[PDB]
Amino acid sequence: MEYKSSPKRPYLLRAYYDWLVDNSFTPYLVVDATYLGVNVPVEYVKDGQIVLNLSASATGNLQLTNDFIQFNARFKGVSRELYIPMGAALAIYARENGDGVMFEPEEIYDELNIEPDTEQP
Amino acid sequence: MEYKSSPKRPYLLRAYYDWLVDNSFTPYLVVDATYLGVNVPVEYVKDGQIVLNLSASATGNLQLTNDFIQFNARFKGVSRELYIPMGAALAIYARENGDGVMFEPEEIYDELNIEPDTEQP
Ligand SMILES: [Ca+2]
Ligand SMILES: [Ca+2]
Ligand SMILES: [Ca+2]
Ligand SMILES: [Ca+2]
């Protein structure tokens, strides 16, 4: 009996996020900016990746859903909304000591690596 | 700078629990019945371990805290309260297909392996 099931990544990301914050660490998220649908300031991307501070003080309206991470943040003082499909989330760790986790591959994220509509009808 | 931090186990256990239940799987918890402070029906322990069904229908007043798992459950029709220190939680998986996780060792649980007071003052 083959059972269909959702990716584990969002649950692991929220687990480590909560653990990091409960221990007063500053949660840093490593993102694959080459993943389709990623919407971040390209000028801050290095080697195809971008590291984001997901602390409560560095983000606004933080959402860690099963399909994506979304929030407002300031870059050089300018507030902008970032949108990150879950497949682009590579790891999350504490800025203070690097403790965290690198998410294991999940084939579903290859299938979901598709460019969404960002323009209105 | 050495940073003190709490064990990750309870966060991982809750992550997998939620993932299992959100995917309609029946969560089974593997417990080390030899760990001090464990309070379970010894008659159901096999090779020093006991497997418990943590589904919403099989448990009552389920608590998955940072230090322990506690709930009421029926064995041969009799309701009894179980208490499981987090250090005794070995793994959690889906009864249906065995998907889940075996918790990694955390030295803190060796230090916490101490017999608590179960009798009143
Ligand atoms: Ca905030
Ligand atoms: Ca948006
Ligand atoms: Ca129940
Ligand atoms: Ca009790």
From Swiss-Prot, chains A, B:
Cellular-component GO terms for this entry: cytosol; ribosome
Disulphide bonds in the chain: none
Superkingdom classification of source: Bacteria
Known function: Enhances recognition of ssrA-tagged proteins by the ClpX-ClpP protease; the ssrA degradation tag (AANDENYALAA) is added trans-translationally to proteins that are stalled on the ribosome, freeing the ribosome and targeting stalled peptides for degradation. SspB activates the ATPase activity of ClpX. Seems to act in concert with SspA in the regulation of several proteins during exponential and stationary-phase growth.
Record-stated family: Belongs to the SspB family.
Subunit record text: Homodimer.
The protein's name in its UniProt record: Stringent starvation protein B homolog
Included stretch of the parent chain: 1 to 121 of 150
